[model samples]
Target: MLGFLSARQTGLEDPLRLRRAESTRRVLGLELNKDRDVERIHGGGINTLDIEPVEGRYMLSGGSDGVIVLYDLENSSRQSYYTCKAVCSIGRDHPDVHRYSVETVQWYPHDTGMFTSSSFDKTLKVWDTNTLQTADVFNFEETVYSHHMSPVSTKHCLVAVGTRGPKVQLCDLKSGSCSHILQGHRQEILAVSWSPRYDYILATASADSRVKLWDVRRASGCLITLDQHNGKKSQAVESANTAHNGKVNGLCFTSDGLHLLTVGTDNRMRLWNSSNGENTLVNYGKVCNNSKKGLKFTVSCGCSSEFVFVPYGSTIAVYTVYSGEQITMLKGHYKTVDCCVFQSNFQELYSGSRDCNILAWVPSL
Candidate 1:
C-alpha cells in the first residue's frame, strides 16, 4: 500500500523551467532525520491542513488554537531527521472538544479509527480514534466553515457541511444525524467539497462570491451555479456571477473529478468544469489570500497535469492545475502560509503556517 510513485518530463523542460527545477530538487533540507518540531501545537493561526495518503506516514492538523493534531510522518531512527511524533489529540483532554475555531481536519474517508473536526464552535465533531471522544456531534447554527467526506464513499457516510449560514449541510456519517439541508447559498458558506470523482458530487464555496454545484440526489436548485459571468441565461443564475469579487474562499476537487479549483478574498484563483460549472477562468493573478479566515488548498493530481498548493502570502503558491501556471514558489513559511496538501502518492508536500509550523515539502530528488 506504500508503492510510492513519481514521473517527470515537461515535453522539453521549461514548463516553468521544469517545474522550477522540480521544486528545487524536491527541497527537503533540515532533515537531520526530520523533526521540525513535532507537537508544539500551541497554535496561533493555521486554519486547516491535511496529509494522509501515506508516504512518509500520517499527518492531519487543524487550528486557530482549537487544535487537532496527528502527526507521525515516519523515519524516526533519525537519518538527519524525518521526525513527526504526536499521534493523538482532539485537544483539552478530549471528551468532545471544539468550543471554537478548529475549522476543518478530515481523515476518515475510510479509516484510522475516525476523525473529523469542524468548528467556529458551530460544531462538527465525529472523533473517537480510540477515545479521543465525541463519536458524533454535529450541532451547527452558523459559523462552521468547511467540511467534507467522500474520498470515494463505498455507498454512503456522507458529510458536507459549510456555514456562517447560507445552508449546506449533509451530515449522515452512518446516521449520527443532520441528514440534509443543501439549499442554495446567499452568502457565507466558505467551503465544502466532495467529488473525489463523484460520490454524490457536491461543492460549495461562498461569502456569496459563488461556486455551488450539488446533486445530493437532486432536490431542487443548484446543479451548477459558478457564475464568473457569461452571456446567456434562461433559468439558473443566482450565484451572482460565479462569485469571488472577494469572498468564495476555497473549494477543490481535481483528483480527476474533472477539475474545480477555487480560492478567493478576491486575490483570485479560479478553475472549473467539474462536469459543468463552467468558468475555466484560468488566470491566477493577485494570488496571496492574506487570510482572515479563508485560505486552504490542496491538489496534485499527477500524470496528466495538476498541482495547486496555494497560500501565497508567507509563501506557498505552486500552481498549474490545468494551466493556471505559477508552478513554483515554496520558500519556507516564516509566518502566514496557512494550509496546503498535495501528496500525490509521493510528489510530497504538506504545509501549515502562522509560524506554529508543520512543513514537509519533498521531491528534491
Candidate 2:
C-alpha cells in the first residue's frame, strides 16, 4: 500500500495508473532496486561505471579522487543485504594512477582481459584488468574527456578520443600511438560514442552546442552536425532545446542503432532518428541539473517499449522513449546522480552519484 491508488471509483483502473501503481517494485526487478553506499570510497565523485561483457562477473568504476574500483557484481556468498566488496583498486600508490579526474573507464568492448581510462590529466591508459596495471598509455596536449573503441571492428583496434581539443583523436591499439585526428568541432569535445551498428561510424558532442556525426572512412569531414532544435519540433522551442542549450554532454545509441538519444545542460532528453539525424523530440520535459560539466543520461531498450533513465537531482527519472511521458522517479540516492548504465541482458541498471556511491537497480520479479 506504499503507493496504491484508489482506482475503484476511477472507472476500472487506467492502464497507465495500474503501471504507475505497480512501479514501486514492479515484477520484482522491474523497478530499480536499492543502492549500496560503500563507506570506504572517499572519492570526490564517480565519473564512470562500466560492466564487463564477457564473464559479466566484474564491473569497473573510476572517480574524481583518482581512484579506480573493481566491484564483483555476482553475490554468490549468500549474505542478506550484501555489501559489494572492492576486488582491487589503482590507488595513489600506483605510479600510473590518473593524476586528475577520471572521465571514462570501459572494458575492451569484446573481452574483460583489458580496460581503458581517459582523464582530465590529458592521458588515456589501457589497463590489464588482471594485473591492475596499465598496458598502454597515450598522452594528449590537454584534458581528455572521453574515449571509445569500435566494438564491431576487427581490422581496426583504434580508440576514439575526445578532449579539450576541438579535433578528435584516433589512437591505434596495435602501435599504441595516435594514428590520426578527426578535425571539425569548433569547441571542446565533451562526449564521444561509436555506433553499435556501423563499424566506422562515430559520434561526438561538444561545448560548441553541436553534435557531429563522423565517418572515419571518409576524408570529407563530419557527416552531419545535429541541431537539436531543428525540424517540425521547432514550433515548440521551449520543448526543442532540451537536447542541449549549453554543451552536448552525453550521447547514446539505441539497441537497434536506428536511433540515438542525447542529454545536455538544457535539462532536456530528446531522441533522434540515427539514420538521417532527425529529431523525434517526444517532448521529455526538463530533467534535472547535477553536473558542473554536462548531464549524463542513458537509454535502455526493452522488448516492445524503450526507456530513457536520467539522473535528476538525487533520484533517477524514468521516461518512456516514444511517448515522452514520465514513467516514475526512482528515489534512493541522497545526492546528485552523475552516471548510469543499463544491463539489458538482465534488465538491470547501475548508477554512480556525485555523493561517491554506486547503486544497482533491478526490476522486481
Candidate 3:
C-alpha cells in the first residue's frame, strides 16, 4: 500500500491504479459486520436487490410478499454501531403494491428519481421516488420473471422484459409504449439483459436450456444461439443448441460487458465470451441452484479483480470470477439466501435471504 502511495506522491502512478488496488483489498476483507445492520422489515423472502447508480446511497428490494422497501444506506450518525434504516416502503396495504410476488427491482440507469419493478401480478411499474407513487404501469397479463434497462451507451431507452411466453418484449419508456419483439427461444424466457457496452445488444435465458443473443435493430432472428458444447461435441440426436442441462434461471454480464455468466437448475454456472459466443470453459462446479424462478447474483465493481457473489443455499458464496476458486461462504441468514448486491463506493455487500433478513457485510476496519 505504501509503495503505491509513494509512487503516486512522486507523480509516477495512474489515478485508477491506486483506487483499484485499495478497492480490491477491501473486498477481500469483507465480512458480516456486527457494527452495521440493515433493519429487518420484510415478512417474506427477498426476491431482488439493486443499488442506484448515481449516488449509491439508497437501495431497492422486492419481497415475495409483494412488498417493496427503500433503504437509506448512508451512515449519518457517525457512530460505531449503525443500522441502515428503512427510509420508505410500499407496504402490502398500498393500492399500488404488487398483487403477487415482486420478482425484480431496479433503479433507473441515470438517476434515482425513478425506479421500476416486475411482478408475478403481470405488471411492470415505474414509480416516482419522491412521491412514492407509480408514474406508469406496463401490463403484459403474463408472468414476468426479469427486466433490465439499457445503460449509458446510446440513445436507446429500451427495457427488455422476459415473460412466460417464448417471445422477449421490448418496451420504450420514451415512446410511452412497447415497440416490438424478439423470438428465438421455444420455451418461457427466464431472464433478459441489455449490454452496458452496446445498447442494442440483448441476451435471453430460457427454460428450453438455451441462451441467445440478439440485435434489436434486426427483425429477422437472433444473432447467436449459445451452445454449451461450442460446436465441439456432437449432439447426435436432433442437433439442438443447449447452454445447460436443466432450466436456466439466472443471467448477468460483467462490468465491462465482455463476458456473461449463466446459472441453471442443473447445479452449474458457466461463463461465456460475449463477443464470440463461446463458453469460456471456466467450470464453477456444483453451484447447487434449485430455484424454480430467477436467481439474483452480482459482481464486485471498482476492484482490480472481480469476485462473483452467488446465493449458495443458506449462505452467499464468493468466488474469483476468472479463476473459479471459492474464497469464502458468508453465513448469517438462517434460511436460504435469495439475492445479493455490491456497493462499489464503500466496498460493501448487502444480501437478503428467505429468513427475511437483510444482512450488511462491511470491510472490517
Best by lDDT: 3
Q: What is the C-alpha RMSD of each candidate to the true structure, in Å?
A: 16.6, 6.5, 1.6
Where's the lowest-lDDT run of ten residues in candidate 2?
A: 20-29
lDDT accuracy of residue 81 in candidate 1:
54
Least accurate stretch of 10 residues (summed lDDT) in model 3? 233-242
For candidate 3, list the clashing residue pairs, or say none.
Answer: none
Top-TM-score structure, candidate number: 3
Expressed as tens digits, the lDDT of each residue in 143-221 for candidate 3 is 9999988875537778888999888998887757785888777888888988768878998999888898999999879
Q: Per-residue lDDT of 200-310 in model 1, one digit per residue for the tens?
A: 888888777778788888877778777765436454645246556778788887877897888888787888888877877688777867455656888765444556778
TM-score of 3: 0.96
lDDT of 2 by residue, 147-263 (tens): 888866676788988888888899988877686889867778888888988988998887776787888877668777676656545445333323467777778887778787877
Better of 1 and 2 by TM-score: 2
Please give the lDDT score at residue 155 for candidate 3. 77
lDDT, model 3, position 165: 87
Once all C-alphas are superposed, what RMSD does model 2 give against the true structure?
6.5
